Coordinates of C-alpha atoms in Angstrom, one line a residue:
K1 CA -0.3 -0.4 0.2
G2 CA 2.6 2.6 -1.3
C3 CA 3.7 4.6 1.9
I4 CA 1.2 6.1 4.4
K5 CA -1.4 9.7 3.5
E6 CA -1.9 12.3 5.2
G7 CA -4.7 11.8 7.6
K8 CA -4.2 8.3 8.2
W9 CA -3.7 6.6 11.8
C10 CA -0.4 5.8 12.2
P11 CA 2.1 5.3 15.4
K12 CA 4.9 6.9 16.3
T13 CA 8.1 7.4 13.9
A14 CA 5.7 5.5 11.5
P15 CA 7.5 4.6 8.4
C16 CA 5.2 8.1 6.9
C17 CA 5.5 8.6 3.1
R18 CA 8.5 11.4 3.6
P19 CA 6.3 15.0 4.5
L20 CA 4.3 13.6 7.2
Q21 CA 6.1 13.4 10.8
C22 CA 2.7 11.3 12.2
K23 CA 2.2 13.2 15.2
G24 CA -0.8 13.3 16.8
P25 CA -2.9 14.8 19.5
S26 CA -2.9 11.5 21.0
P27 CA -2.4 7.6 20.7
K28 CA -6.4 7.2 19.9
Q29 CA -6.1 9.5 16.8
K30 CA -2.5 9.3 16.1
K31 CA -3.1 10.3 12.3
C32 CA -0.2 11.7 9.9
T33 CA 0.3 15.3 9.6
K34 CA 2.2 17.0 7.1
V35 CA 4.8 20.3 8.7

């Protein structure tokens, strides 16, 4: 499935696409955010 795009759920420092840092307001809503 390629990589993890923004808006998708991902763990800490997960294998994001590139621009995403894999952040999130909480562990239950941890999604890949772009900077």
